Write a protein that binds this ligand. Structure first.
Ligand SMILES: NC(=O)C1=CN([C@@H]2O[C@H](COP(=O)(O)OP(=O)(O)OC[C@H]3O[C@@H](n4cnc5c(N)ncnc54)[C@H](OP(=O)(O)O)[C@@H]3O)[C@@H](O)[C@H]2O)C=CC1
Ligand SMILES: NC(=O)C1=CN([C@@H]2O[C@H](COP(=O)(O)OP(=O)(O)OC[C@H]3O[C@@H](n4cnc5c(N)ncnc54)[C@H](OP(=O)(O)O)[C@@H]3O)[C@@H](O)[C@H]2O)C=CC1
Lengths: 235, 238, 236, 238
């Protein structure tokens, strides 16, 4: 059974992605950085849906640790057919007010996390000889920029550049590589949503997960190199 | 049962869209300009799947005829929950070589067609009080341009602008409005297969169902937060 | 002989500012208007006082055969145009259900019929100069992103972008660059809405748009083609 | 006189930018990582053009060293009115074949370089109370991605997002912030020349001044309503 890894799937959008993929019939490996009990709960819910699941715990920034965990996981359970890079991080503030840690942790969590998670997994995916699916989670801010988020905008835009480049490299292997860029998602804010978003509301996590689930499906086999915005018309 | 009109659904991409929407559980109205026998065949295939279906024949450029046919159809069968504007036209040629007919017929079929079909249908859709779905079919050419296709590029680009603007107007009524922009799709048919191997990252033309599946997803209840978008289904071309 | 540029809709507004800047850059500039002949002649006088040759042409860009006859005769008398700026445009705003047939048709055709009707008689005279060339279309932020009450105008301005990009591909081998300038909200004749919605907190001035067109028409912009350049104060 | 810092301006695109800005009437501070003699030659050319100039030497990745050099320079010569961030590095290779150094050096040179150079300079620019100009140099690869360049594409795409976000924060100060994305620029074998002939609509690589002229326009007073933009100078590539 084809297996998909979803980073940051203990709660929020990542959890909703993991559950939709399980309902689609994929085996789903859960992941979290520190919330082991939440990850275990999602694992139980996936197993209740009739699919195999377990969790892995790592900070996507710990390069050598992520490699050891993923290589051991692929040896024990086979290569991943799909990977969803969902875990991200914000440290908001005006650009001259950002600290070094504000900047570095935000950039690396996205861009080093891309390298650290996917580099060990590309050849095991290719070796399944059945195509594959990679989906990254960016943001409206990675497309357009946002005040107080020069670091987050850079990180999520860089994720887009990496995703499009990787799509070109993996296309001949029938592996599609796409990005989903959510808008404002519910995880006086309702008044801002009423005023600024054409649909007049924040998105729900399943409205994002549905797009990821579609891209991971066999039906989406001619969609690659794309950034798909799920943002209620914001841009 | 929610009903969806698919223009140009007698064959090709539009037929695949129509069959996929029927399989998702929509009643589907088939449309063609002149190929009535193929339209009748698609209607029968949709009926055989367990959904209601009939066909409408019109040229989308005949503004007053289209209005009369659609108003009578809505009177008889209720408002459309969805409209997929798939019917299109090319007349390729270098810009100095294009004739008036080459230019006018390509621009109008996309832009007159958008107006002529949607204008009679907006209020019947809103009156359903359950949201709605509008999907237009553009092209990679409407995003980036293409040699020999200044007319088609303008026509398909103009469809993107109209789609995005209408998305803004209809969002408060829970009607999403999106565009699907295919790349090179195999609709039938050695040179064009080698051209696909070199130019397209996936190294092949797309199949009609690979376009129809994206349209089907956008028409589904699960795509309720996607609007104002151009979704490219092009094998990585751009 | 001096390179000559046609600016449609240059009797007033953005098109006038474009014509004056192109004259100051040393082009001969031909002024055009649909009906405001007195204003066209005043722009011609200013271009002449600026030191360049100028005259005006009057036509509705939708009158395909009349446009063809006027442009053919003008090129016969004065030579091919090195540049063409398609600036003249038209809005008929309103919610989509409120638009009349005329609201829709006049807006679509003024941009897309105008593109075809003005450029078809001029492309070969431009190519036959054998010195490259410049074509610039005026779109809008609405043609990129859409705007409420402007389904017709967004379609018209987005269609212009597609035409521009495709023609850039066809003409690149002749060293004719083809680009689009997409202004945001420009002051030509609300002020509080500008302060709230535009990062620069103000409307643009006509010369801020004209400066981009002038730059694209310059010899220095020889490697820029197929582009949509937004002049919008940060709006998108 | 308004002063502009151009990073990596001892040769190539950066040198062409520095010279064009001096001819436009700006004082221009040259920069290089190690090529000290080349930097001094550019300084002398700018002085001969009639503007004030000197050079600064640093690796944009050396965060605290850059901060100390720039703080001292602003102390001695005043805040910069403009900054042109020309800081990039490639380490090409198939993605699963990239080393840690291939990845990290490319990401950091662009994104650490943005932070390390611009953070010390934002407040001194604002304190001029005269507006300002920031231009970053990206690449067509940062817009569409490129095979063998997952690292460079991510680096150059991250620069675009940082630039757009910073444009939003500084717009109220009349500081415009824009990105220039060159295509293939002649900075050449027979193979490279032939690949330019076929991929690029203009059928040639760009020259350094064709890029510098766009930077120079953006830095001019006339470009005062252009901000948050990525302007591609690529011969029609995309
Ligand atoms: N095929 C491709 O590679 C690509 C296609 N597209 C777009 O996808 C859509 C479908 O592509 P394709 O499958 O080629 O279908 P076509 O674009 O070939 O149009 C075929 C359908 O449109 C109908 N049609 C054509 N002109 C009119 C008109 N004036 N009034 C009413 N109906 C009309 C035809 O009716 P009849 O059967 O009676 O002739 C037929 O049902 C089009 O919008 C096309 O531009 C975009 C990118 C690539
Ligand atoms: N002003 C703004 O805020 C913005 C404008 N734009 C675009 O910039 C361009 C100029 O804008 P603006 O300065 O407002 O001027 P307009 O767009 O109102 O066009 C005015 C000029 O176009 C001419 N014109 C109008 N219709 C026709 C026609 N059918 N045939 C021939 N000439 C015609 C007028 O001629 P006469 O003088 O005889 O009437 C006048 O010279 C347009 O393309 C517009 O869409 C885009 C974004 C914002």
């Amino acid at each position: 059974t084809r297996r998909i890894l979803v980073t940051g799937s203990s709660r929020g959008i990542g959890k909703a992605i993991a559950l939709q993929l399980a309902k689609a019939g994929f085996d789903v490996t859960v992941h979290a950085r520190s919330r082991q009990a939440e990850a275990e709960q999602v694992v139980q819910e996936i197993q209740a849906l009739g699919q195999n699941s377990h969790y892995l715990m790592f900070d996507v920034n710990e390069r050598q640790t992520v490699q050891q965990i993923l290589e051991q996981d692929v040896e024990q359970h086979g290569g991943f057919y799909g990977v969803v890079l969902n875990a991200g991080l914000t440290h908001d503030g005006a650009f001259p007010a950002l600290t070094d840690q504000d900047w570095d942790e935000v950039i690396s969590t996205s861009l080093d996390g891309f390298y650290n998670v996917l580099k060990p997994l590309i050849m095991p995916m290719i070796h399944l000889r059945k195509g594959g699916r990679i989906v990254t989670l960016s943001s409206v801010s990675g497309i357009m920029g946002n005040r107080g988020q020069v670091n987050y905008s850079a990180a999520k835009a860089g994720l887009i550049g990496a995703t499009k480049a990787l799509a070109l490299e993996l296309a001949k292997r029938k592996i599609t590589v796409n990005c989903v860029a959510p808008g404002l998602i519910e995880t006086e804010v309702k008044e801002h949503a009423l005023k600024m978003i054409p649909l007049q509301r924040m998105g729900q996590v399943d409205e994002v997960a549905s797009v990821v689930k579609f891209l991971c499906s066999d039906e989406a086999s001619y969609v690659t190199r794309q950034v798909i915005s799920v943002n209620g018309g914001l841009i």
